[PDB]
Amino acid sequence: AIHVGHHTLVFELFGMTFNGDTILATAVTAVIVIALAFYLRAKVTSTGVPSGVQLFWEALTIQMRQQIEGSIGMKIAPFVLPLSVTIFVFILISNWLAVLPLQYGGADGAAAELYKAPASDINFVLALALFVFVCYHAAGIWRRGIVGHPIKVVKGHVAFLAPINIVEELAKPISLALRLFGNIFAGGILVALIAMFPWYIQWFPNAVWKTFDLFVGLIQAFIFSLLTILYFSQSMEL
Amino acid sequence: SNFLIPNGTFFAVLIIFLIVLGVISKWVVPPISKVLAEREAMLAKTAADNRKSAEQVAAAQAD
Amino acid sequence: MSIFIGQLIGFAVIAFIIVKWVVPPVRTLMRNQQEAVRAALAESAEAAKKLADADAMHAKA
Amino acid sequence: LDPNAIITAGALIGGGLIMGGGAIGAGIGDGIAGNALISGIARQPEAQGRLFTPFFITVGLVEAAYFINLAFMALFVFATPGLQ
Amino acid sequence: LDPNAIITAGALIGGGLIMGGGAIGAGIGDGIAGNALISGIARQPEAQGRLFTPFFITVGLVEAAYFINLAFMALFVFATPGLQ
Amino acid sequence: LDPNAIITAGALIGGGLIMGGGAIGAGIGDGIAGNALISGIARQPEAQGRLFTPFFITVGLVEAAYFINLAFMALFVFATPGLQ
Amino acid sequence: LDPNAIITAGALIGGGLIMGGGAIGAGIGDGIAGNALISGIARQPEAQGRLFTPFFITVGLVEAAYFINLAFMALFVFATPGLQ
Amino acid sequence: LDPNAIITAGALIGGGLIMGGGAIGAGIGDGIAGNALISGIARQPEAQGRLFTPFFITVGLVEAAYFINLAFMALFVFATPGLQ
Amino acid sequence: LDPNAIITAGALIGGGLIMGGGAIGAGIGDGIAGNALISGIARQPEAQGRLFTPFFITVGLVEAAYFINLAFMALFVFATPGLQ
Amino acid sequence: LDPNAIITAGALIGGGLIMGGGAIGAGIGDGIAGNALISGIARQPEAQGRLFTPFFITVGLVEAAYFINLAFMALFVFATPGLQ
Amino acid sequence: LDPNAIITAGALIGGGLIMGGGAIGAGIGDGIAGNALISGIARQPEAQGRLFTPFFITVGLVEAAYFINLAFMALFVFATPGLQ
Amino acid sequence: LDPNAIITAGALIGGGLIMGGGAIGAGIGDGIAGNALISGIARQPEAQGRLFTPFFITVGLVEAAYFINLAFMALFVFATPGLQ
Ligand SMILES: COc1nc2ccc(Br)cc2cc1[C@@H](c1ccccc1)[C@@](O)(CCN(C)C)c1cccc2ccccc12
């Protein structure tokens, strides 16, 4: 009894369905991120030994700024730094919160998770990917003009490959979303399957898989942020 | 069914993300960039001060 | 319950691994960065004091 | 017999094909990218930092196909299209 | 027996084959192109930028096939040709 | 069983095989050609344009095969041979 | 059931296999030969005229293998042996 | 004819496909990564440790896919979705 | 129904598999051998002739397998063993 | 049509796929690792001693993938899941 | 429906798989060995006579496997184990 | 239909898959190992004597898997598990 899907806390509003579990997980991740941000704002110091949170935040900022400088000058695209930092920290926290021991028995032999990684929901990945898509297309329009930008994206580096380029433009958002989704969704299955073992055997495969899933989530967050940065760089040029 | 079908959840998630972005855009990245710039300026000032101390000592010895 | 017990034991193993073989190196890196920043601030302090001493010497001579 | 039985058998076989192809592609592409990374590090062992960015770009591009296939296999097997 | 069931099972198997092949091709081609990019960056760190233009000319093509297949797979399963 | 349904299922499976093989070939061939192009550009930047004439020949020969498969896929799927 | 339906489904599956294999072989072989050609031309411009001679020979042995398969698919799908 | 029999046969075939694809991908990717590791150790013996960090990453990225496939294969055979 | 129908469908599927494998092997082997030949001619323009004697051998061997498969496919398709 | 017969046929096909994939992966990965080892020993005769360390790791990571498949194959055909 | 018909169709498909795998393996292995031979002869022309000894070994092994498969294919299609 | 007929057809298809995968793996791995051996001998002719110890190991592993597959093929075909 895998019980794939089956969102809990589903409710209705404005003639639309909302998956309460995904909203709750996203809210918890946002609360954690905002708490870290305000703890930094309280303990940020340029004339003293940096605290752990300041070190972490400045490490992320330095990494993302280095990526931007490598791809497109920070002068051209300043906003990409906050956007990429937000994306990375959000995805990383959302994925790493899944390591906590919040899985139990559903009273029917099926595993139930109090907190599921929100990236396991198509809506979360779709929101992130579509926001990045619109943001970098708007940046391209700003840099190239409303008429110039579509011409440049259709033409690409080589003009006569205009069809392929078009597909590539549609390939960017989907690949940003599904990839993430997939690598998280699969994980959600794994734990559930591991929950079918007896308690005296479930611990070892569960421990191994979750220990590796920490690194997997870190890698996925980094990849999402880096791909967003280089998509912005491609959109904004010439 | 079809858990893969996009839902209204999408909009909700977006809003939350936007809020986080704002918090990052205003109270995380600008202060951190300012801290990094101040640290780099401090290092450059230290190097310049060392060089200026050296040259001033040399000039005092010479003149 | 059984699922909860198994996953709790798994989380205990995960925490043991992280504390034993992940926390030490990352804390070492954090301490190294803190020491680097502290040393930079100090070096700035002694550089300023050295420049003050050099200015005093120049004024004297 | 039950039409849904045949549809489900076909969906399971199709999902198996999807996942097998995705696994082959992911494994071979990740191996090739890791070979590039390891060879580059061996050539000049202090280039580790600057190679991880292109390596992870390659890894992301390779895993894109794998995890898109995983998502579509999940669609096939859990919400089968055209299932009567 | 419902003929639509046979047609739908065949369509699911065909879409599974399409995605398996697309995944294999995309993964291996992207891995190969990324291997080239990583080696070039390792040997010439200054090339970080100038190697993206050919790389993404390659990846694009490699992705194209995959996603083209994706479209047809959808057409196979969501609007099955020949399905009475 | 309607014979047309069996023929349609077979045609769909065959078209899926055609597209899978075409996608594998196109992806891997384009990846290899792009590896060659990226390596050539990395070794010497001035050759970029000079290398587009052969590279696009290779991609011309690879993609062509894919296209042919696609065409016949249509024949298999939209106007099925032998569909009584 | 009609024997012709089963025979036609089998013939379509066989033709799909034929073209899938042919496309895989043609694409990968053309990619490898083009990689050789691109690397050679990158090494020195003067070789471009000469290197195109062996290259075609390679493409002659590769593409030929494809087209033979293509021909046979026609035999499978248009004049099915043992169609009864 | 029990529909569960057909569903179980399809699930077994799909799980076999998943495991075969995972085995191919894992084996070839691990072989390629190990080839890079062996070549690096032969070229630069003192970089052995430095070369183990990327290698175990590649394996981690490769092996993981395998095990993911493995998990889903179990899901096919022990928790067959769509079982009636 | 007619035993010959099932036997002929199986024979066509088997012949399709045989030609798919033969085409894959022939294409990839010929591409690899031609890559070796092209690289050799590029590096050593004066080796043009000397590299045909080995290359042909390789091509011969590769082609051998392909054509052998072709023969057996005819045996599979035109004179099906075990037909009854 | 005994349900056990269909389930056993599906299990045998799945086990055959598992072993085919495992054999392909093991053979190709071992060949690549051995290529690395042979080249390293050829260029550095004295390196043999150390080169057996990474090699045995690579083979260990490849053969393992093989011998896991074996086990599950032994599970498919000797204790078939879902059998009744 | 004669059970011999089903058994013969299964045997034909199995023999087709055997020959397809053998053809792929033989073609690719012979191509790789010939690539090595051509590269070595280009590098060291006087080594030709010396390089044919290892080459004939490699091909030998490759060919061996192919031929073994062929033998078993003859067993599958001509004297099918399990006819009744 | 006779249950043993379906079981035997499935067993034959599974054995064909086993041998196809084993043949592909054996051929390609042997080709790669022989490529390494030939390249090593060409680079240093006198190294031949010491290059056979690793080569025989490589092939020794590769062939192992293949032969193991062969054994199980017999088990599938000559003593079919689950045969009624
Ligand atoms: C440009 O590339 C090409 N070059 C060729 C070279 C030689 C020959 Br003879 C045929 C060629 C055919 C094409 C494309 C084409 C362009 C336009 C129309 C028809 C076909 C292509 O087939 C490329 C597919 N590749 C990348 C896997 C394609 C097919 C289907 C859908 C596409 C969607 C988007 C882009 C390309 C799409």
Side-chain angles (χ1 to χ4, degrees):
Chain A
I2 301 299
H3 284 205
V4 164
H6 301 342
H7 293 282
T8 49
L9 300 167
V10 167
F11 67 91
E12 182 65 26
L13 195 83
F14 288 106
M16 319 170 54
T17 313
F18 292 78
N19 303 331
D21 49 352
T22 304
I23 308 308
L24 173 54
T26 314
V28 169
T29 302
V31 167
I32 298 277
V33 171
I34 293 161
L36 277 164
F38 281 124
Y39 182 76
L40 167 61
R41 190 192 164 179
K43 280 276 282 297
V44 73
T45 61
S46 66
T47 48
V49 306
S51 63
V53 161
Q54 182 181 344
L55 288 155
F56 154 72
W57 274 120
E58 88 178 32
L60 294 174
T61 302
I62 277 159
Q63 185 64 23
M64 296 296 172
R65 184 179 68 189
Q66 277 169 4
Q67 289 309 147
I68 290 153
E69 306 278 23
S71 296
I72 191 170
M74 254 294 309
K75 183 172 145 292
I76 288 164
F79 48 81
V80 173
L81 170 55
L83 173 56
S84 78
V85 170
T86 314
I87 282 157
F88 177 94
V89 72
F90 206 61
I91 296 164
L92 185 149
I93 300 283
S94 70
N95 296 335
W96 274 5
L97 281 167
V99 71
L100 296 164
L102 301 174
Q103 191 190 36
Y104 63 96
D108 50 28
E113 285 88 19
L114 297 177
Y115 173 91
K116 285 173 291 311
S120 83
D121 194 48
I122 193 78
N123 298 287
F124 180 93
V125 304
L126 272 179
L128 259 62
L130 291 159
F131 181 79
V132 166
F133 178 80
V134 166
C135 278
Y136 76 70
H137 272 290
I141 282 158
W142 163 58
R143 284 266 298 163
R144 296 168 182 172
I146 190 167
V147 70
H149 166 78
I151 290 281
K152 182 66 174 66
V153 308
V154 165
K155 290 173 71 175
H157 302 308
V158 298
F160 56 84
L161 294 187
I164 298 284
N165 300 129
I166 288 157
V167 170
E168 183 178 1
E169 296 317 312
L170 303 184
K172 287 190 198 320
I174 292 154
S175 66
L176 294 174
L178 283 176
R179 163 174 40 219
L180 183 68
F181 169 78
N183 189 358
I184 303 304
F185 179 69
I189 310 313
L190 265 288
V191 191
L193 279 158
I194 285 158
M196 303 195 184
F197 276 131
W199 74 264
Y200 49 87
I201 293 149
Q202 165 184 358
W203 61 272
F204 170 75
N206 173 286
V208 169
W209 172 250
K210 294 229 285 199
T211 298
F212 190 75
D213 204 335
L214 291 173
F215 290 120
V216 166
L218 170 61
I219 287 157
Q220 288 300 114
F222 179 74
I223 283 160
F224 204 113
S225 73
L226 185 58
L227 287 169
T228 295
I229 286 153
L230 62 83
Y231 290 168
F232 267 97
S233 313
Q234 272 159 25
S235 173
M236 325 169 60
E237 65 183 1
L238 189 139
Chain B
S1 75
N2 201 325
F3 66 103
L4 294 172
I5 193 77
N7 208 4
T9 295
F10 157 87
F11 295 109
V13 161
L14 190 62
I15 302 304
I16 286 156
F17 174 73
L18 284 180
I19 283 157
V20 181
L21 178 66
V23 169
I24 297 279
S25 296
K26 280 73 176 175
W27 294 302
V28 175
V29 168
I32 286 284
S33 287
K34 182 175 73 175
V35 162
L36 297 167
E38 287 191 357
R39 200 170 288 157
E40 183 178 1
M42 176 207 66
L43 284 182
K45 181 69 176 177
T46 295
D49 268 10
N50 279 308
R51 180 212 49 68
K52 176 166 46 213
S53 278
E55 69 85 20
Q56 189 191 43
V57 162
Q61 178 268 347
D63 82 334
Chain C
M1 191 71 238
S2 51
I3 287 157
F4 172 84
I5 291 284
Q7 63 84 30
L8 190 83
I9 298 165
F11 173 81
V13 172
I14 295 161
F16 180 98
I17 287 165
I18 294 288
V19 168
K20 199 77 203 149
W21 298 302
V22 174
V23 161
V26 68
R27 289 296 184 275
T28 299
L29 261 64
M30 266 189 183
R31 185 179 65 248
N32 289 341
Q33 293 179 356
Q34 284 187 331
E35 182 61 21
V37 174
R38 187 215 57 70
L41 292 161
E43 199 172 323
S44 195
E46 292 83 4
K49 192 174 73 63
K50 192 167 92 174
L51 183 63
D53 283 330
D55 291 331
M57 183 177 176
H58 205 300
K60 185 177 69 57
Chain D
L1 56 82
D2 201 341
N4 278 1
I6 281 166
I7 287 160
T8 291
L12 287 163
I13 286 162
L17 286 153
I18 292 163
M19 275 285 284
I24 286 160
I28 294 171
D30 290 322
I32 290 160
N35 174 355
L37 182 72
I38 298 157
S39 300
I41 285 159
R43 186 269 187 189
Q44 189 274 331
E46 298 275 293
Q48 306 180 5
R50 62 204 185 73
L51 288 166
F52 271 114
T53 293
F55 168 68
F56 281 121
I57 294 169
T58 299
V59 159
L61 296 178
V62 169
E63 304 307 3
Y66 178 66
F67 289 120
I68 295 160
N69 296 115
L70 198 149
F72 278 106
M73 179 276 285
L75 180 137
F76 273 38
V77 307
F78 296 116
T80 303
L83 173 76
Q84 299 174 232
Chain E
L1 182 61
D2 198 15
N4 296 115
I6 301 299
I7 291 157
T8 307
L12 281 155
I13 291 160
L17 284 148
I18 293 166
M19 294 298 102
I24 287 164
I28 294 167
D30 284 336
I32 285 159
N35 171 293
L37 176 84
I38 295 155
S39 294
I41 281 161
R43 282 155 156 79
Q44 282 90 18
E46 70 269 340
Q48 176 67 73
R50 77 201 179 77
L51 285 167
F52 275 2
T53 294
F55 174 71
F56 287 115
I57 287 160
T58 301
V59 168
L61 291 157
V62 173
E63 310 278 41
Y66 179 87
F67 277 100
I68 293 161
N69 296 114
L70 191 152
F72 285 97
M73 180 269 309
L75 188 153
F76 266 41
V77 307
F78 295 116
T80 302
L83 185 83
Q84 307 110 350
Chain F
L1 294 174
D2 173 21
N4 264 30
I6 298 282
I7 292 158
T8 293
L12 281 157
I13 289 161
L17 283 150
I18 294 163
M19 281 318 264
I24 290 160
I28 289 169
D30 286 29
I32 293 161
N35 177 339
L37 182 70
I38 299 153
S39 277
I41 284 160
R43 298 274 190 289
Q44 69 276 17
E46 69 275 16
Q48 171 143 20
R50 188 265 308 288
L51 292 169
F52 271 40
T53 291
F55 164 76
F56 277 128
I57 278 161
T58 304
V59 165
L61 284 161
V62 170
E63 299 290 2
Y66 180 101
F67 174 70
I68 294 159
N69 274 25
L70 172 49
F72 284 101
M73 188 222 78
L75 186 86
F76 273 43
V77 171
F78 296 114
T80 300
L83 187 88
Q84 62 202 332
Chain G
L1 187 57
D2 201 346
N4 276 0
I6 289 168
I7 285 161
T8 295
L12 284 160
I13 288 161
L17 284 155
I18 292 162
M19 294 299 291
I24 290 161
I28 299 183
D30 283 359
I32 289 164
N35 176 354
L37 178 80
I38 298 153
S39 278
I41 281 163
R43 263 33 164 181
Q44 65 182 357
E46 55 255 46
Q48 174 150 19
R50 166 182 68 259
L51 282 167
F52 269 117
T53 288
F55 173 76
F56 295 145
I57 285 157
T58 306
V59 163
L61 294 150
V62 172
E63 285 293 299
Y66 180 70
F67 281 103
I68 287 164
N69 296 115
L70 173 67
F72 271 105
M73 182 179 72
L75 169 69
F76 272 39
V77 305
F78 292 122
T80 306
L83 187 51
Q84 183 186 330
Chain H
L1 180 43
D2 180 15
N4 294 295
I6 298 157
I7 287 164
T8 294
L12 284 159
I13 290 148
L17 284 159
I18 293 166
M19 267 289 269
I24 288 162
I28 299 173
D30 289 352
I32 292 163
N35 173 354
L37 178 73
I38 299 152
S39 292
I41 282 163
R43 182 196 185 75
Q44 275 211 335
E46 294 294 328
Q48 181 145 22
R50 293 181 184 271
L51 297 167
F52 271 118
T53 300
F55 175 73
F56 287 138
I57 289 164
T58 312
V59 166
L61 277 163
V62 172
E63 209 74 29
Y66 180 83
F67 279 106
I68 278 165
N69 296 114
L70 188 74
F72 277 91
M73 179 269 291
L75 188 146
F76 274 37
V77 309
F78 303 121
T80 305
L83 199 67
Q84 294 173 5
Chain I
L1 61 83
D2 197 331
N4 262 32
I6 295 90
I7 296 163
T8 293
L12 285 159
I13 290 167
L17 287 158
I18 295 159
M19 294 298 102
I24 289 163
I28 291 166
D30 292 338
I32 289 160
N35 168 301
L37 183 81
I38 296 151
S39 283
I41 285 164
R43 291 197 224 282
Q44 206 179 344
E46 293 179 353
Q48 183 62 255
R50 179 174 76 268
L51 299 182
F52 292 166
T53 291
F55 170 69
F56 287 142
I57 284 153
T58 311
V59 159
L61 286 163
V62 174
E63 294 294 328
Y66 180 72
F67 284 113
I68 292 157
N69 296 115
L70 166 53
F72 272 103
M73 177 267 288
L75 165 58
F76 269 45
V77 172
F78 287 112
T80 309
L83 198 66
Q84 50 86 5
Chain J
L1 277 296
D2 193 349
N4 271 17
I6 295 156
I7 290 157
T8 312
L12 282 151
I13 292 162
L17 290 149
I18 292 164
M19 281 279 90
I24 292 161
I28 301 188
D30 289 337
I32 296 161
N35 177 352
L37 178 72
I38 296 155
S39 299
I41 285 161
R43 298 194 313 96
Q44 288 69 240
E46 61 86 20
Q48 193 162 2
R50 58 162 184 285
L51 288 198
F52 278 154
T53 300
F55 182 65
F56 291 149
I57 299 169
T58 308
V59 170
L61 272 169
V62 167
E63 294 283 312
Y66 185 69
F67 283 112
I68 287 161
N69 296 115
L70 207 72
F72 283 88
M73 182 263 274
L75 183 63
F76 267 46
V77 304
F78 290 117
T80 305
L83 203 73
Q84 66 245 30
Chain K
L1 201 159
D2 201 334
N4 274 2
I6 301 143
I7 291 170
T8 300
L12 283 159
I13 291 157
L17 286 152
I18 295 161
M19 287 282 273
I24 292 162
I28 301 187
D30 286 347
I32 291 157
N35 174 350
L37 182 70
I38 298 149
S39 287
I41 280 162
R43 199 208 171 81
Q44 286 222 3
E46 284 298 83
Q48 177 171 2
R50 186 179 295 275
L51 293 168
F52 272 109
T53 297
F55 175 76
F56 292 149
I57 287 159
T58 307
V59 174
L61 294 171
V62 168
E63 293 293 328
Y66 179 93
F67 280 116
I68 287 164
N69 296 115
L70 188 153
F72 283 114
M73 173 270 291
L75 180 77
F76 272 41
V77 306
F78 291 117
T80 309
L83 289 170
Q84 46 79 14
Chain L
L1 318 172
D2 177 34
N4 284 323
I6 290 154
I7 292 157
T8 313
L12 283 158
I13 290 163
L17 285 150
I18 292 163
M19 294 299 291
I24 293 160
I28 291 165
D30 290 335
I32 288 154
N35 177 298
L37 180 70
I38 300 154
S39 280
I41 285 161
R43 184 176 177 87
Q44 180 171 22
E46 61 86 20
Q48 189 195 264
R50 70 192 160 74
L51 281 167
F52 275 114
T53 290
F55 175 69
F56 291 162
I57 287 160
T58 305
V59 168
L61 294 160
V62 173
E63 295 301 335
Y66 172 81
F67 278 112
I68 285 161
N69 296 115
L70 192 148
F72 280 104
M73 183 278 288
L75 169 74
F76 276 42
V77 179
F78 287 112
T80 312
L83 193 72
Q84 293 160 350

